[PDB]
């Protein structure tokens, strides 16, 4: 022979992968990679985030000072984990605008409580209850002060507190709703109560609502919880003539990266930067189809369960 030949071609694989294109919906290529992370490990790694496990306590009960949440004093968290087995074992209470306070305290990241010296003259301090036993005797919340009449009278309390620091102060107070019209006058000689808490720019006035409620842990009275924020240079004034659950100090308010998450997954000692209510998930892929609630540097939640990206040419076998 006095000639030659030179053929050109490309490679192929026996099994390729089906991908979607602009024209076709199923076209077979030599290789593809997955873009949607759709599985979780099942555990919540405690690095490099600071996770706090709220075993049997919610955030509000750990704020108020429930006797079975006394291990949560001055807890500093980066992410609070709330379990579903949580319950309350103190005086039955109620919070108007509960979600607002829960999100305000969850995003602050601290339970640091500075005690202050209030002067309540003419009343009896450190009221107790048999529904909130702290030890073998009666008790109450550890951050609140239940004031009642001193002997035979209940004067008009009028107290002040200035803010000379350079941070905001959070005060938590409450009002007591009695059960009958006889226990009102046996604790506060006045036949009607009223609580006013005022700063230089706002004011809140609450009046107790006497009535009967369902029995909860042996009581038909209630407590309503309110809060106030004092900014640097402001002042706080508290006026009352009955039905006052006074504060004992203030919480320090911070700003940063902190949140809260309801999940029943255990906690291990791995390392991951993303946390979902199902556990920690890796973040090598841009999208995820596990949960739409996420904390950290997490991929985005999509509705598709699989998306393959082609990293090779078309597959034309023999």
């Amino acid at each position: 022979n006095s000639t030659a030949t030179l053929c050109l071609g490309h490679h192929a694989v026996p099994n390729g992968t089906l991908v979607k294109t602009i024209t076709d919906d199923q076209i077979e290529v030599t290789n593809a990679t997955e873009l949607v992370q759709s599985s979780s490990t099942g555990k919540i790694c405690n690095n490099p985030h600071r996770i706090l496990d709220g075993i049997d306590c919610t955030l509000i009960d750990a704020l108020l000072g429930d006797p079975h949440c006394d291990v949560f004093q001055n807890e500093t968290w980066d992410l609070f984990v709330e379990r579903s087995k949580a319950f309350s074992n103190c005086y039955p209470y109620d919070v108007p605008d509960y979600a607002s306070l829960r999100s305000l305290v969850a995003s602050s990241g601290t339970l640091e409580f500075i005690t202050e010296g209030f002067t309540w003259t003419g009343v009896t301090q450190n009221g107790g209850s048999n529904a909130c036993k702290r030890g073998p005797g009666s008790g109450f919340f550890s951050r609140l002060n239940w004031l009642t009449k001193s002997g035979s009278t209940y004067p008009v309390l009028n107290v002040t507190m200035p803010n000379n620091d350079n941070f905001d102060k959070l005060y938590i107070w409450g009002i007591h709703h009695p059960s009958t019209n006889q226990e009102q006058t046996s604790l506060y000689v006045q036949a009607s109560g009223r609580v006013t808490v005022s700063t230089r720019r706002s004011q809140q006035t609450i009046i107790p609502n006497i009535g009967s409620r369902p029995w909860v842990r042996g009581l038909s009275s209630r407590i309503s919880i309110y809060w106030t924020i004092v900014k640097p240079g402001d002042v706080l004034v508290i006026n009352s003539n009955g039905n006052l659950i006074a504060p004992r100090g203030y919480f320090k308010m911070r700003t940063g990266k902190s949140s809260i998450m309801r999940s029943d997954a255990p906690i291990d000692t791995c390392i991951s930067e993303c946390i979902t209510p199902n556990g920690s998930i890796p973040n090598d892929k841009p999208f995820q189809n596990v949960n739409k609630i996420t904390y950290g540097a997490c991929p985005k939640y999509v509705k598709q369960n699989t998306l393959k990206l082609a990293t090779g040419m078309r597959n034309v076998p023999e």
């Binding site: 000639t3 192929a12 597959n315």
Partner: protein, 172 residues
């Protein structure tokens, strides 16, 4: 598939090719052989890797957000939150779909274009000593050795040395 090289005038692929993505296969007067071409494979690999590592780098980092699961029925605020979440999810899924749909097409078309570029370069090298047989191969009308095909492979083929012999062989 826009240039018609892969799945076009090249019938099938070569499953015995394990060195690179594109390569040659010659039939000579001393036997047969096979080799690969590093430059086209490298260009395709670099482009596909650049695209891939372009899309997968992260952009978001969220710490505090709104509530997305509720235990009660409340009213306006819950309705607005659910509407916001549904709109966000529906608007991100469409982007997730369209990005992949566009990039797969572009990847296929570029991996098809590289083959046509290699073919056209090889055709331009063999000026008038070869004829295209229509199925991806060239019929070379002069007689080469295993050292003549390798000069065509590493881009130093001298066409004017075999011109007279090829012209007398192909045209008469």
């Amino acid at each position: 598939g826009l240039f018609g090289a892969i799945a076009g005038f090249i019938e099938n692929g070569w499953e015995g090719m394990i060195d690179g993505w594109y390569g040659f296969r010659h039939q000579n007067s001393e036997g047969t052989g096979q080799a690969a071409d590093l430059k086209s494979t490298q260009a395709a690999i670099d482009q596909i890797n650049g695209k891939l590592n372009r899309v997968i780098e992260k952009t978001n980092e969220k710490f505090h957000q709104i509530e997305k699961e509720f235990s009660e029925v409340e009213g306006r605020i819950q309705d607005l939150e659910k509407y916001v979440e549904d709109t966000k999810i529906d608007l991100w899924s469409y982007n997730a779909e369209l990005l992949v749909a566009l990039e797969n097409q572009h990847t296929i078309d570029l991996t098809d274009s590289e083959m046509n570029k290699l073919f056209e370069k090889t055709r331009r090298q063999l000026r008038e000593n070869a004829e295209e047989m229509g199925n991806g191969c060239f019929k070379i009308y002069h007689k080469c050795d295993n050292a003549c095909i390798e000069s065509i492979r590493n881009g130093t083929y001298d066409h004017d040395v075999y011109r007279d012999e090829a012209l007398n062989n192909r045209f008469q």
